[PDB]
Every structure is written in C-alpha cells, then in structure tokens.
Design a protein around this ligand. Structure first.
Ligand code: HEM
Ligand SMILES: *[C@@H]1O[C@H](CO)[C@@H](O[C@@H]2O[C@H](CO)[C@@H](O)[C@H](O)[C@H]2NC(C)=O)[C@H](O)[C@H]1NC(C)=O
Ligand code: MAN
Ligand code: MAN
Ligand code: CA
Ligand code: CL
Lengths: 464, 103
C-alpha cells in the first residue's frame, strides 16, 4: 500500500522525512515510492534489473504503441482507409482529438470533479500527464490521418494495412529528423554532437539498440528545463484570458483543459513563444515539480528531483565518479577537486555536506550540477550518457530513415524538408509558426514566420 | 523471424535479426555498469538504517532536493536561446524510448 503507507516493506521504498523540512512538517509522513518491477521477480541469483515497457527505437511508439493489443485499439477498424482512431465525443475546433481511455481509478476526472473529462488513449500511457504533452500527441495522431488521407488520393488501389504502415513509417522518420537534426545538437552542443554522433554511415547489426538503465535517470536532465506554468496564447501570441499563466501543479492530468479550454492551439502557441527554464547551479528545478508534483490527484504532492534520486538507488545505479570513469572523464575525490570540475566550490562543499564523497553523488544530482557545454544544455557527463544512447538508437536501427532500402533516394529528399513548424501548420489553425530551429526560436515576433514561407512535405515520390 | 520485411513490428521484435528482442518492448534494460545495491543483488542504498555507502552515510533524497535543488521561484532565469517546445519535445521523445513499470 505504497500510496498510503510509510512502512518499508517490499514493493515500497518510501522517501523518509528530514528534520526542518520546508513543507512536510510531520516526520512520521513520507514521499510514496514503488520499487520498479524486477526483470526477474524474487531471484537470489540474478542482480536485480528493471524493465523497459517500450521499444527503444525512435519509431514513434508513443503514437502506435509497443504492444499488439493496444496498437489495434488505437487504429480505426471501421474502414480500409488505414486511419488512427479519434475522440468520438469532442473536437478541437473541427480538428481531431485523442480518444478517451476506459480507466478504473481515472486521475484526470479528479483534476475537475464537474468537468467529467477522463484521460486520453495514445501509444504511451503518459499522454494526459501535462496538456503540453497531450498537445504534441494530438498533433501526431492528426499527422498519421493527414498522411493516410493524402496517401489514399495518391494510391487508391492501396488497402488499409498499406495506408497505416506507410503513414507510420513517415511519422517515425519525422520523429528521427526533428530529434537528430534539430533537437540533439541543442542538447549536446557542437563538440559532443561531433564526438558522440558523427555522420551516419549505415545500419550496423552489432550495435546494441537497447536503452541502458542509467539513460532512464540521466535523460531526466529535462526536469531542469521545466517552467513553473503552462503558457496559453491567442491568435496574436498575446496572453489568452482566462488562465494564461496557469501553475503546473494544477495542470497535471488536467485533460479537461484541452477539451474545455480552447484545444491544443493556445498550448502549442505557448511552447513556441515561451522561453525554457535555464539550468543554473543555484536554480536547478522549480517548486511546482519539487514540492507540488501531482498535488490534485494524490494524498501528498511529490518531489520530482528527490524521486529521480530514489529511482537511481532503486535501479542500483553506481554513483557519480563511477560514471565519470565510464565516460573517460576525471573523477574528483576532494572538495577542491569537485570544486574545479563543477567550477563552483559553493556547490562542491554542499555536495560534500550531503554525500560525503563524490563517489556517492546520485547520477541525476551529479549530472545536472556540471557547467553546461558550449551551445548545449548538459555538462560533459550527461552529454556522454545521452550521446552514446542516441548513437546506438540510430546506428543499430534496421529501419533508420537513412539506411539503404528503408526509403528511396527521392523519399529521403522529400523527408529532408520536414520541420516541426510545418507539421504544426499542416494540422492546426496556427497561421504563424516558428522560424527554424523551433527549439531555439522563443520570442514573438522576432523569431516567428508565416505558413506560406514553409514548404510542405511532397508525397510525389510515394506514388506507386 | 521473416526473411524479408518492409515495416517495423509494433514490439520492435525482429529489428535485429541475430538477437530478435534487442530494442523490443517488455524486456530488461541493458547495463553499462554492474549494479550497486546494499546486499550486492537487490536492496537499494538507503534501505537498511546505519548501512554506509562507500564509507559514508546515505543522504535522504529529499534532503539533497532541499539543500541543493530548492530555489526561490522569483529568481528564475529564462533561457534566451531555448523555447519551451525544446523541453516538451524531450519528454515526448523520452516517451518513445523508455517506461519503467512499477507494481
Ligand atoms: C513537467 C513535465 C514532466 C513531468 C511532470 C515529468 C514527470 C516525471 C515523473 C513523475 C516521472 C517518474 C518518476 C519516478 O517515479 O521515478 C518521470 C520520469 C522520467 N522523465 Fe520526466 N517529466 C516531465 C518532463 C520530462 C522531460 C522534459 C524529460 C526529458 C527531456 C523527462 C525524462 C524522463 C525520464 C527518462 C523519465 C523516466 C522514464 C521511464 O523510464 O519510466 N521528463 N518524469
Ligand atoms: C472545471 O471545469 C469547469 C467546466 O465545466 C469550469 O467551469 C467554467 O468556469 C469558468 C470560471 O470563470 C466559467 O467560464 C464558467 O462558470 C464555467 N463553465 C461551466 C460550463 O461550468 C470550472 O471552473 C473548473 N473548475 C475549477 C475549480 O477550476
Ligand atoms: O577521449 C577518448 C575517447 O573518447 C570517447 C570517444 O570519442 C572515443 O572515440 C575516444 O577514443
Ligand atoms: O557499452 C556501451 C559503451 O560503453 C563505452 C564505450 O566502451 C563504448 O564503445 C560502448 O558502446
Ligand atoms: Ca519506440
Ligand atoms: Cl546502466
């Protein structure tokens, strides 16, 4: 009974309360925590490991699913148009919305007792976690049906199975293109991008494409970027009243905000024209996720940075210096050494106050404490963990968009044009998208452009 | 395992023909380093009261959050060079790669 008990009995590993806590004044209470499922339940031979419920590939399994029964249930099985099923109750100003999920204890109904709006059904179970994430999912489902609709007018002889797969292969390829060309260089920085992700040659079958255990805690660097509000904007990119600067503690699982508060368009406009939160050694993560994570739908609001650290211990991940060594990076022993590595002896003394030694620093804590790599948003350690993962995901993917046989030379030429701003134009009522690169363009109107200037993806090379 | 194929499987099964489960869903993560547990095989550090890690007491994850992570909401720094879409794409992409189930 992890959600309600403080007793440390398996599968519970609750976070104990420190004295003089800034919020939890009761030391008999705790932050609930369920130990991750063992790969080998109850063994006394195997070193406990955890499961990845998804496909490691960048195959857009957050749209199509990673298991067969779910995949079918996401597809419109009424016609031979090869479409992805849509909400049959509500529509975002005519445009499609993710279908609702039949859940037992639905947390999305808790966020507003009078709205009676449940969670959404997508490729991945976490669709309704934040409306910003739901919007991105709503955008991709629209693209699958935009692609299969356009694909039918092109090749009418093609059946539903031929329509679904081809539209799936396109979406998947778009996810790899935005990720590798636009996303990753801004995460790693020029130097790490060149080191960890040199130019694609061809798929290699000896490259292990699995997600490493540490990647699951390391990629959580993303938590440091989290802004404390959901920013909604009008057709003119001005604050959209009512609720234009809504706190995140009131947006988690708040699916009703998509269905009853102007659709995905003010949300999507906000992600384009609002700056991300920058990571500073004295400004690591906001209190909306550090003190009020899922306040509405739980007995207590959780602490994301602290769950990140408990999860690394649950997963038995080695500490900071072990990973530093793994990457070929120096391993500080002293507070002066850590001070030099972090370029901040105030933080080094603080990290030594808690951990005692740089060996014990939790991977996420150590990772996010490092100075940011030039034109990147991670330090040398996380750049190594993240870069290595993504190389394997590309170099060990038989269906990588650039591998010989996957797409024709012309398809590759057509696919190379795509951009997230164009996809936002192709599927919404947003007339003013962002000038490439979408991840750097954060100010209106300085960084913004009109849809007519954006070239759409031409499916002429798909004509059979 | 099919001899010739044009599309991906839903599960990732058969992407690597030599080791057909690699990258496929509902399988154990790979490990880049051996795991470090209290007992060497399952108990996490911090589980048993008084049990040190590498010769030092184990700091409560919440105390680390309070002492290093905590900051005044007002004193926030906006990224001059990044949009919030950069954040949101990261979480969406994370959701294409991994999900660690709990009971
Ligand atoms: C405000 C939005 C976000 C919320 C509320 C959120 C929430 C969470 C929560 C509650 C967990 C599970 C924590 C646990 O019990 O150990 C989690 C895990 C994770 N998050 Fe975040 N997260 C967000 C954004 C991001 C971003 C932007 C990234 C990366 C760019 C990211 C990467 C991850 C990863 C890898 C995990 C573990 C995934 C797994 O294997 O289950 N998160 N996040
Ligand atoms: C939960 O959702 C309901 C929608 O049913 C919200 O109701 C709207 O609230 C605003 C308040 O300014 C008004 O436009 C209307 O009075 C409401 N419309 C309807 C149809 O009820 C309600 O505010 C939400 N709950 C909370 C506590 O925020
Ligand atoms: O630092 C040396 C070592 O770092 C890592 C990779 O970039 C290797 O190719 C290189 O040999
Ligand atoms: O094992 C993962 C990764 O670890 C490190 C290096 O030895 C790499 O060559 C290797 O790919
Ligand atoms: Ca996937
Ligand atoms: Cl690992």
């Amino acid at each position: 009974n992890c959600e309600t008990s403080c007793v440390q009995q398996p599968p519970c590993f609750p976070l104990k309360i420190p004295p003089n806590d800034p919020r939890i004044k009761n030391q008999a209470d705790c932050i609930p925590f369920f130990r991750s499922c063992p790969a080998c339940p109850g063994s006394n031979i195997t070193i406990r490991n955890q499961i990845n419920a998804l496909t490691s590939f960048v195959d857009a399994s957050m749209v199509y699913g990673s298991e067969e029964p779910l995949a079918r249930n996401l597809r419109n099985m009424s016609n031979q148009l090869g479409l992805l099923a849509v909400n049959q109750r509500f529509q975002d100003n005519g445009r499609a919305l993710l279908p609702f999920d039949n859940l037992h204890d639905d947390p999305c109904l808790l966020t507003n007792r009078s709205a009676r709006i449940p969670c959404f059904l997508a490729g991945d179970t976490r669709s309704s976690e934040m409306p910003e994430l739901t919007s991105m999912h709503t955008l991709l489902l629209r693209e699958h049906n935009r692609l299969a609709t356009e694909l039918k007018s092109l090749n009418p002889r093609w059946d539903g199975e031929r329509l679904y797969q081809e539209a799936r292969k396109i979406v998947g390829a778009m996810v790899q293109i935005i990720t590798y060309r636009d996303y990753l260089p801004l995460v790693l920085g020029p130097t790490a991008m060149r080191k960890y992700l040199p130019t694609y040659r061809s798929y290699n079958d000896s490259v292990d494409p699995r997600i490493a255990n540490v990647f699951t805690n390391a990629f959580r660097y993303g938590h440091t970027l989290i802004q404390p509000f959901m920013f909604r904007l009008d057709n003119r990119y001005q604050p959209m009243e009512p609720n234009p600067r809504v706190p995140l503690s009131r947006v988690f699982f708040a699916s009703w905000r998509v269905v009853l508060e102007g659709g995905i368009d003010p949300i999507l406009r906000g992600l384009m024209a609002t700056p991300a939160k920058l990571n500073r050694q004295n400004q690591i993560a906001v209190d909306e996720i550090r003190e009020r994570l899922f306040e509405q739908v739980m007995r207590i609001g959780l602490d994301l940075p602290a769950l990140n650290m408990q999860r690394s211990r649950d997963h038995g991940l080695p500490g900071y210096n072990a990973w530093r060594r793994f990457c070929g990076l120096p391993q500080p022993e002293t507070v002066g050494q850590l001070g030099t590595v972090l370029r901040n002896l105030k933080l080094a003394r603080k990290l030594m106050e808690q951990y005692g030694t740089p060996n014990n620093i939790d991977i996420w804590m150590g990772g996010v404490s490092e100075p940011l790599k030039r034109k990147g948003r991670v330090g040398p350690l996380l750049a190594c963990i993240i870069g290595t993962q993504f190389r394997k995901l590309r170099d060990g993917d038989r269906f990588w968009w650039e591998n010989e046989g996957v797409f024709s030379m012309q398809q590759r030429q057509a696919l190379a044009q795509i951009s997230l701003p164009r996809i936002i134009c192709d599927n919404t009522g947003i007339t003013t998208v962002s000038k490439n690169n979408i991840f750097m363009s954060n100010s209106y109107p300085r960084d913004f452009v009109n849809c007519s200037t954006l070239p759409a993806l031409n499916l002429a090379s798909w004509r059979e | 395992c099919p001899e010739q194929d044009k599309y991906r499987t839903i599960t990732g099964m058969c992407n690597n023909r030599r080791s057909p489960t690699l990258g496929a869903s509902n399988r154990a993560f790979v490990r880049w380093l051996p795991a470090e547990y209290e007992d060497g095989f399952s108990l996490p550090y911090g589980w048993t009261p008084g049990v040190k890690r590498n010769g030092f007491p184990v700091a409560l994850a919440r105390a680390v959050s309070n002492e290093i992570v905590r900051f005044p909401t007002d004193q926030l720094t906006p990224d001059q060079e990044r949009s919030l879409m950069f954040m949101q794409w990261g979480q969406l992409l994370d959701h294409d790669l991994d999900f660690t189930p709990e009971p």
